[PDB]
């Protein structure tokens, strides 16, 4: 049966990548929270 | 934004109050109008978005004094 | 005009292997490890200058480094660039 995760690297990066996060104030707040938490991986980019 | 260029009047918030004193949030908007003001010193019309109150200020103080205030506040016209 | 300083950094080591040994025997081709940002033009200039041989052509590829475990700690070796440098017939 077809499951929910159907990977596409292009869609992944456009939806959740670093530049998508940086493009809005709320996305920049995500990055600020994840830096404050000390995440090794800020985004799906890397 | 709904801001008078002369007075700085802008939307303020308050309540609607029913007869039963139910409070619901509302805004009070300024009575704004775009108006072409003749500036005799420049032989020109200057359009300002102004409250009716701001138009009375212009009538009292004169357009030249008001535009002088606008320039000194960084208010572009 | 590529500067000597640049040319002295681009060639890192001879690559030693059975494929590299065969390349030298059969096709007069030396296999080198080169700087990851080295271009074909830089490699050609460096080989001609530093080894005093006529180069016919440079083919290049990037070797992706292997993921390895060193006692339950994931690590990755570095990517590196390999150059197949074909020398002219007399060299």
């Amino acid at each position: 049966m077809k499951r929910t995760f159907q990977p596409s690297v292009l869609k992944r990066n456009r939806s959740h990548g670093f530049r998508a996060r940086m493009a809005t104030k709320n996305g920049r707040q995500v990055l600020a929270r994840r830096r404050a938490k000390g995440r090794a991986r800020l985004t799906v980019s890397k | 934004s709904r801001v008078c260029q002369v007075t700085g009047k802008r939307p303020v918030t308050g309540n609607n109050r029913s007869h039963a004193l139910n409070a619901t949030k509302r805004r009070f908007l300024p009575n704004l109008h775009s108006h072409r003001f003749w500036v005799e010193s420049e032989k020109r019309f200057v359009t300002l978005r102004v409250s009716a109150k701001g138009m009375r200020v212009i009538d009292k103080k004169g357009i030249d004094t008001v535009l002088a205030e606008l320039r000194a506040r960084g208010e572009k016209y | 005009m590529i500067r000597e300083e640049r040319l002295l950094k681009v060639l890192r080591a001879p690559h030693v292997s059975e494929k590299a040994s065969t390349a030298m025997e059969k096709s007069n081709t030396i296999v080198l490890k080169v700087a990851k940002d080295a271009t074909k033009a830089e490699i050609k200039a460096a080989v001609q200058k530093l080894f005093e041989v006529e180069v016919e052509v440079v083919n290049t590829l990037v070797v992706k480094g292997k993921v390895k475990r060193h006692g339950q700690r994931i690590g990755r070796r570095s990517d590196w660039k390999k150059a197949y440098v074909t020398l002219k017939e007399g060299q």
Binding site: - | - | K9, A13, P14
Partner: protein
């Protein structure tokens, strides 16, 4: 050897730099071949390059 390098001109430092870079190249090739016994020479030439480049920048300006 900064003091002795300090009594050379830019042109003398630039030829000195080239000599070190060629020496660094030869040692790098020797280490790759499995023939460099004296592994300490690699660090020595590297630090000598740094010293020459430091003095070139001092004789330039700051």
């Amino acid at each position: 050897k900064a003091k002795e390098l300090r009594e050379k001109s830019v042109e003398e430092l630039n030829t000195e730099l080239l000599n070190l870079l060629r020496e660094q190249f030869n040692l790098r090739m020797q280490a790759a071949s499995g023939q460099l016994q004296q592994s300490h020479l690699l660090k020595q030439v590297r630090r000598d390059v740094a010293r020459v480049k430091t003095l070139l920048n001092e004789k330039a300006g700051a």
